[PDB]
Point group: C3
């Protein structure tokens, strides 16, 4: 019985970080409380100055990652401020009933609601907005993120041995549908409502103009690259709420991967490239053995290098000649 359990309040953090949490816990079930606020905002998504009339949870794409343990209850307060123009709600793939909660969280601008559900299944699960008659537009404009429900005794390999991570990162991949004018340049709209009709026409072609990690081309590069060090194990959470993708770490692997994202199933090992189905989140563990700059990308290489689906991980530490060695550097062909 839920209203008799202890409550705890969690403060969310912006992607690509994930808020502090315990993996294996001796703690009993809790009601874990969160809040999120919708923000409609225009956003620059590429190096040409192209804009998207965007819709976000807490101001970011993706929304923040929420983390609980199997058997906890999630209690979310969803706020839709009067500065917004549209109605919104939330569907948790991790929940059971009432269209994932969407039927109980319909909030017009100026309103809020509170939902509770039991997180009775372990894994990474998508959440997204789903207002009647406007579902795909709200999703592709930026309203999605991940709930992670960890098993109470932590992650396990196929033989039941313990697995861990030292840091977690969250990557949301967004297929965007930006309209063009008769001059062949991308259109810039004064309001969110004015972008609607033209955007639906692009969507129906099923061809994205851009595909970006965390809100823009190059979001996870330069000063904003992911980081790690040799010997450290990282969890990479990858959500795609609308379209399939195929993650790959250049110079690495997926040591243990749940591509369907559900921790009660055995992971697979040694993957070069894995597959996240549109409408889900998956998770990969990797332990760095070499330093350097890695690329993490969608391995449809057109989607990655032409359309935007790629980022960087900068890894410090000591080079290992046993794993790889330059025997002869590039030099003229002997004759």
């Amino acid at each position: 019985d839920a209203d008799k359990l202890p409550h705890t309040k969690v403060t969310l953090v912006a992607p690509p970080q994930v808020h502090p949490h315990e993996q294996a816990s001796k703690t009993g079930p809790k009601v874990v409380e969160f809040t999120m606020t919708i923000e409609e905002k225009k956003m620059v998504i590429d190096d040409k100055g192209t804009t998207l009339q965007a819709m976000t949870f807490n101001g970011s794409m993706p929304g923040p990652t929420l983390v609980v343990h199997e058997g906890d209850y999630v209690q979310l307060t969803l706020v839709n401020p009067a500065t917004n123009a549209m109605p919104h709600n939330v569907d948790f793939h991790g929940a059971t009933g009432a269209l994932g909660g969407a039927k109980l969280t319909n909030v017009n601008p100026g309103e809020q609601a509170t939902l509770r559900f039991k997180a009775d299944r372990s894994g990474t699960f998508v959440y997204h907005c789903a207002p009647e008659g406007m579902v795909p537009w709200h999703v592709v404009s930026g309203l999605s993120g991940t709930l992670m429900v960890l098993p109470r005794d932590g992650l396990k390999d196929p033989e039941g041995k313990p697995l861990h991570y030292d840091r977690a990162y969250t990557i949301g991949e967004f297929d965007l549908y930006i309209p063009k004018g008769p001059d062949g340049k991308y259109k810039d709209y004064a309001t969110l409502a004015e972008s609607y009709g033209d955007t639906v026409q692009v969507m129906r072609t099923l061809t994205p103009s851009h595909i970006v990690f965390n809100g823009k081309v190059g979001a996870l590069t330069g000063a904003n690259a992911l980081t790690a060090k040799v010997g450290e194990t990282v969890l990479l959470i990858h959500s795609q709420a609308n379209r399939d993708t195929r993650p790959h770490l250049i110079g690495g692997h997926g040591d243990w991967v749940w591509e369907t994202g559900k921790f009660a199933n055995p992971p697979q090992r040694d993957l070069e490239t894995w597959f996240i189905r549109g409408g889900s989140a998956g998770a990969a563990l990797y332990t760095f053995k070499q330093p350097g700059v890695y690329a993490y990308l969608n391995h449809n290489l057109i989607e990655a290098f032409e359309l935007g689906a790629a980022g960087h991980i900068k890894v410090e530490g000591k080079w290992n000649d046993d794993l790889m060695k330059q025997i002869k550097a590039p030099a003229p062909i002997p004759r």
Copy 2:
């Protein structure tokens, strides 16, 4: 030896139902006899009045589901009436040899043939027409369905424990390629042969105009919604003979799923969204715990809500506040 076994005759039923059958059986192997008749027919596929020059098994899209047990023999009589214009045949992915049977069932209008094959592998398998030189057109125009071969001792979980369903439903998803004229409206053709050339041109773009469950937009809604009740376990069979899809139950899950559709492999549990490869059938079990109207859809949300890949399940019974509760209804933001 097959011609020495008992024969039984089965009467097929129209989708989305599946004909009565036993799951676990003590019965020994049988020769199980079926008949199907091809019908070429023009069909309205959307709410605008758009038509498809269609080709069907028994008058429906998909064709009916055929159910036998591992070790039975399937003996099908295929009839091509003289009212049809084209030659046809059948390829069972469940069979071994002769292009799945296609080489032995080539029937011109006015003809019939009878094929027998051993159903020696368990799972859900696609069948489809495949006439030399015209294969993709006949498949995308509607000629596909599912053969289910159940293990003799019923379905099993990864630990070998028994699994069951109380009702089965069959959903065929069809990517359609309808041509347009210079005014930008869909074309209506007087005959099947006249649609051919224009349709090939659309197909080569790889962009469907429509994607529909069971023959039309909204086929599985209103009076024709699927039904169930709290406590009941349903099997959802999903076939796609030409193109990938990603099934999802809104407010539910896949309790146990064989996404590749082959029952001798362990299922996965707790899936949010699964993946049916073009050219296959997969199967999901779910036990309802909450009443209400669920949506069952392809979670490329453009494909579902714009192009047609979505239906409804109406579930009766008692609401469960432990799984989900509205703590505070939508109301003004406190100030």
Copy 3:
């Protein structure tokens, strides 16, 4: 320590064959030496005379398959002759560090380099060229192939029982992006550099003009069909370095399949159609039980029959009436 182990030199062979090798071996770890030479060349890819300005490893699409055992070291010499125009390198998905080796193998025309890496993970893995700023163009123009790393004690089923193959075949599937002129005919270019700008524009549509096995439409048909015989077990290696595909054997199955391509994971059995993610190689075993001409294809049937993704296997031996029998040949409908 690698520079203290025995060295062996291997001679590569052209696809669809794979060079002779042992499956299970009592041999200890070796440094296994290979060489490959890049060849830029114009190539006819269809029956209309269409050309591709191509880039290849050893003159073929795909590149040759390299085979070692888990714990061996791969030592490759990569040569870029002065007759070529562009810089090249190599990224092995099977390797750890330095962008899979790409950072250590940058060779301008007239140069060569030698790389060594430990093949410490079993499976089939893609290798491909990846020059800074030009990655997708070099990959889709033909620069990819497969490294197979076999477990030291051979392939195993989910229960640890031994599995074998009698012959191996390697199939590379290539999505091509050929530009058209204002008359709607495919363009023919005098040099590789002149095709670049127009080709990028086609790539960004994400719609291939052609999809071919081993370099052209019908590559693996007629005199160049694959072969086998009843009772023989074949391994079919399928690589796709840029785009998803869904292999199917018409009249057969995947007896045991590693669709993600990594041999330390249990295979699945009885598959009708499997899935190779863009940016990977997978492997299927099948034992022929019936003679005849099989088709092996991508089961997006438009991609196979309209765009080129299909080949043939000719199988000799004795027909088996227990598995399949024509009960009644095509004949007039009785009245």
